[PDB]
């Protein structure tokens, strides 16, 4: 019915506190759950209800710093959590060598992203080490892996790489030419972007692709006007009321951001139907515990709560900050990041 | 060996074979964030896992420990990596590991780590003999599982197994002509074998799609395929298509058809066609039909398209 702002604020507060053993599968990616919650509070202008200082220390304890002999540069970045059992060290002393300890691209991304949201200035971030680690993750085809030990590679990680380079304001972290090639090669016959060449185009990968190009500032350069028109068509066809991620699939709240943000970057979100979208998103709101679910009368989670709110933000919901569609942080945060970049250039 | 729910299950801290190892606990510092609470049993397994990892112990007991860690949480990518390290060190029977992962994936078909693990195994064995059947089983519980289709394309390409895919595709399109994943697979097979440059193939495909469209006219996937295989050749270069579509409009109408027409007319305008000002009017007329009555939800979009055509061809 209406936006239960306070309820959602408590929801995110709880997420930062303690989770039931039934969310153990998120252990190695707790940092992204932190992001969903922090960025979600930021989006609701409630970052005051948390101790920015404690959380900043926690995040820094997750950074994989290079060792004395700088022999582990290709493995630096951030961890999803402390699951490896390394002694709590908030980026103070050097690096305590460990056979299997290394960063995860999605954690380096959400980590830096969280630090900026909390006001930190990234002075304790070994920028060169992170960039070195990033480079190590890129494959011949231009895409990226999540960890140096090996993993699947797709558009999700291309977006992570792009965000990292953007925030550290240094693109030496990737071979941009090859990344762009990968993004082009992922365009389907139906004109959407897929996780990789030949695969079914999808709302999530289309967002990752388009947002990556925007972050590099090369959308126009990479896709022709005819091409962009075709992509726009594929994207806007995703709205049913709310948005689905693929043709002939039921809608899901989070696509209101994935696809909506893409439409925004392509400058035609304004031509979508706001009311039906807003109504759907709200219909998935959990009026009892707060947060949003993928479908109405479904269990809520951090991911849908955050993206449902960002989806609402795209339409300027009363009480929600404007979201930076490509960086996935509040404009306030994106602005603060600009100030930060300026200060460095001295 | 010893199941996690066996009446006689024993914590690792109470097992004689593990007495020489000092368990390593996880610490999130003074003020923990998004901290997950773990049961005695769960924390026990992982406290020993950390210990074994930290020492890179390539032992048989470590290998068995991973099975338990994976049961507690199959999304821990580090556990899977270490298990692979052990598979090599202990030179374990990979054919058996295939059975293991085959079961794990059936219970967790949307997990990234399990699909990655299976792919590494198939690469090691250079044996794709059981892949297509396995994937078909998974696609049977969820015909749109992205992980399954992704793996299926990898196998088919890596070991060149195209011989029966187009037939598999035809079968699934019969089971559900609306499955967007299957239409994508169809284009994957064809463009990687015969290609679409053979006028005979193009004709077979355009004809096949129109047949499917006639069966279920309101199917975005079918229309997207039809437009997909022709858009780069030039929609205006197929005069009989334009009329065959206009003939469907009477009964088999849908926003997809109307849209296709608009795209045909636009290709014409883009190619200095005859009676330009007349074509543009035919287009605009359709854009408005879409906005006002056929695809109302995209009302502002279609009118936006209309304004675009006018300011470009006048």
């Amino acid at each position: 019915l209406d936006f239960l702002r306070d309820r959602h604020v408590r929801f995110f507060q709880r997420c930062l506190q303690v989770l039931p053993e039934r969310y153990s599968s998120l252990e190695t990616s707790r940092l992204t759950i932190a992001f969903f919650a922090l960025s979600g509070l930021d989006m609701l202008d409630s970052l005051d209800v948390v101790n920015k200082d404690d959380i900043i220390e926690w995040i820094y304890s997750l950074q994989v710093l290079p060792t004395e002999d700088r022999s582990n540069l290709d493995r630096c970045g951030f961890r999803g959590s402390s699951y490896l059992g390394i002694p709590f060290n908030p980026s103070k002393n050097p690096g305590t060598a460990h056979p299997y300890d290394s960063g995860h691209i999605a954690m380096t991304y959400t980590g830096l992203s969280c630090l900026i949201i909390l006001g930190d200035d990234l002075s304790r971030v070994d920028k060169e080490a992170c960039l070195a680690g990033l480079r190590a993750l890129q494959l011949e085809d231009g895409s990226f892996c999540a960890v140096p030990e090996g993993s699947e590679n797709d558009m999700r990680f291309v977006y992570c790489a792009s965000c990292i380079c953007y925030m550290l304001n240094n693109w030496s972290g990737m071979d941009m030419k090859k990344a762009i090639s990968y993004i082009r090669r992922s365009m389907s016959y139906d004109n959407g972007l897929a996780q990789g060449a030949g695969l079914e185009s999808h709302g999530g990968s289309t967002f990752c692709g388009i947002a990556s190009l925007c972050l590099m500032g090369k959308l126009e350069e990479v896709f022709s006007e005819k091409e962009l028109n075709r992509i726009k068509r594929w994207c806007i066809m995703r709205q049913q009321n709310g948005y689905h991620g693929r043709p002939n699939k039921p809608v899901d709240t989070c696509y209101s951001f994935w696809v909506g943000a893409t439409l925004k970057l392509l400058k035609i979100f304004q031509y979508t139907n706001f009311e039906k979208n807003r109504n759907y998103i709200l219909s998935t709101q959990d009026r009892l515990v707060g947060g949003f679910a993928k479908w109405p009368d479904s269990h809520p989670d951090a991911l849908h709560a955050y993206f449902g709110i960002c989806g609402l933000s795209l339409m300027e919901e009363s009480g929600i900050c404007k979201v930076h569609p490509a960086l996935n942080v509040s404009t306030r945060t994106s602005e603060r990041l600009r100030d930060l970049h300026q200060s460095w250039k001295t | 060996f010893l199941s996690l729910d066996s009446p006689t299950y024993v914590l690792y801290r109470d097992r004689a074979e593990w007495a020489d190892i000092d368990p390593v606990p996880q610490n999130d510092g003074p003020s923990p964030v998004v901290q997950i609470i773990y049961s005695e049993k769960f924390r026990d397994v992982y406290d020993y896992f950390r210990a074994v990892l930290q020492r890179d112990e390539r032992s048989e007991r470590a290998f068995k420990l991973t099975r338990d860690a994976i049961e507690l949480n199959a999304a821990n990518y580090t556990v899977w990596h270490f298990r692979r390290v052990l598979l090599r060190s202990l030179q374990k029977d990979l054919q058996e590991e295939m059975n293991y992962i085959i079961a794990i994936i059936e219970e967790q078909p949307k997990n990234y780590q399990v699909w990655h693990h299976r792919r590494v195994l198939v690469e090691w064995l250079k044996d794709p003999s059981q892949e297509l059947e396995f994937i078909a089983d998974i696609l049977n519980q969820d015909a749109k599982n992205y992980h399954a289709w992704q793996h299926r394309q990898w196998v088919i390409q890596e070991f060149r197994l195209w011989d029966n895919e187009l037939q598999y595709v035809d079968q699934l399109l019969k089971e559900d002509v609306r499955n967007n994943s299957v239409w994508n697979q169809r284009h994957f097979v064809i463009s990687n074998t015969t290609g679409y440059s053979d006028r005979a193939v193009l004709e077979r495909e355009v004809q096949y799609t129109l047949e499917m469209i006639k069966l279920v006219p309101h199917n975005e996937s079918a229309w997207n395929y039809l437009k997909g295989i022709l858009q780069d050749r030039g929609l205006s270069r197929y005069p009989n298509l334009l009329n065959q579509l206009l003939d469907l409009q009477p009964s088999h109408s849908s926003p997809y058809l109307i849209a296709f027409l608009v795209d045909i007319y636009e290709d014409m305008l883009e190619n200095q066609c005859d009676n330009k000002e007349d074509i543009l009017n035919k287009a605009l007329e359709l854009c408005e039909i879409l906005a006002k009555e056929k695809d109302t939800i995209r009302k502002e979009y279609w009118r936006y398209i209309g304004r675009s055509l006018q300011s470009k061809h006048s």
Binding site: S29, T32, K294, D301, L303 | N111, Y112
Partner: peptide
């Protein structure tokens, strides 16, 4: 149910 992104 839920959406797996990692």
């Amino acid at each position: 149910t839920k959406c797996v992104i990692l």
